[PDB]
Design a protein around this ligand. Sequence first.
Ligand code: UR4
Length: 435
Amino acid sequence: MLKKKQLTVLDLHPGAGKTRRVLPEIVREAIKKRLRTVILAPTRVVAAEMEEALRGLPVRYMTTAVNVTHSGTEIVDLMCHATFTSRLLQPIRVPNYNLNIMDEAHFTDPSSIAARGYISTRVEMGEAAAIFMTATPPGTRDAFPDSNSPIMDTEVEVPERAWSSGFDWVTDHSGKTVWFVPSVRNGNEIAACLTKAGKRVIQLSRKTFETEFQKTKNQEWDFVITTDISEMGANFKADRVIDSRRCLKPVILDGERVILAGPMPVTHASAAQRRGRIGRNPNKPGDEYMYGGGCAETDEGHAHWLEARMLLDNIYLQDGLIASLYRPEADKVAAIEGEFKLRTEQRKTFVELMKRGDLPVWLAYQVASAGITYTDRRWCFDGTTNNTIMEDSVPAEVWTKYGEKRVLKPRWMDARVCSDHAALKSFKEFAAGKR
Ligand SMILES: COCC(=O)Nc1nc(-c2ccccc2)cs1
């Protein structure tokens, strides 16, 4: 696998031991051959699991998720997918890694797509080797891959709202259930309904993931209610998955706003990863997978692929050359390489709106490309009346940095800045000049 000019897709089934058995073997071989190597973890949780699998090997952990004293003699670096892309965008030297290893390489967050595009472009150039580790590479059509033990697959109507009757099979279960919901808000309603029925419920989402995931290890629980983030190598001691088979899809309308469309069907890859949370123990056959809809290729026209092009347009490769998306995912967006390339000062604004601002890529781009500077928040208040952000059926209000109470009315509306209470709170703080 380790010869230059090669990209290898390690597509062993979920639970086959890619992370705990194959990855340490690859790393040992890489060190033997003096390959400067990066290992990309999708999350801080997986980064910590990798440290356990790699413990004893000279690996530099570029994450505060691991508390290790580095020797200074490591040629293998480990960081999150997002950290890799972030360091590429920033005015900081990223080594030209000979070997690029991406774990959970199916991750469809913009920074992961961008990292695959950059890595696969370096391999196509003949400059590097890469290994993408995933049961479900782009365009996979099999929602029902092999497992370590037989799974009971049942198509069933799954609740997406509180219920009083008609779903006894949900609560009548005495094991542990991982339940994939399309959104935080939908999970909150299911979680309240299960809590009222006497169940112990943990909720996971992107913003709460590291903190709340620890509860699945430290306390007894009956249900984990999770968004799609648990597709990215989160492991549970569970005997059932309940899968809505639904997700939200960010969509750019008319080049001018972003909506969260759906809920709508998940991809085959997502369905296989959700299912793949169970059937992992060869000694425990008959884990159950209850699924509430079909799959569709809802990654086509999804904003994350256009966002990935915005990031790649702003990463230096060589002179004016721009990295392509990884070929199997390159048709998910109608975009021209270079269309989003910013001049030096606008690019810095774009980076800071994402890194410090915590704005979605698309929104960061609109503000930066309009020639607005990072601390200038006038745009949060001067949109049309129909861009008014609503909080519990009333216009959201903040005190501006000037001490004026104003209605939150952004010039560009991205539904992700108000998708749940936590998002809207963060965006209000941003509009107020608090970061
Ligand atoms: C599952 O097999 C049928 C199918 O693919 N149905 C879909 N429904 C959508 C959809 C749903 C909500 C909002 C917009 C679009 C996309 S695909």
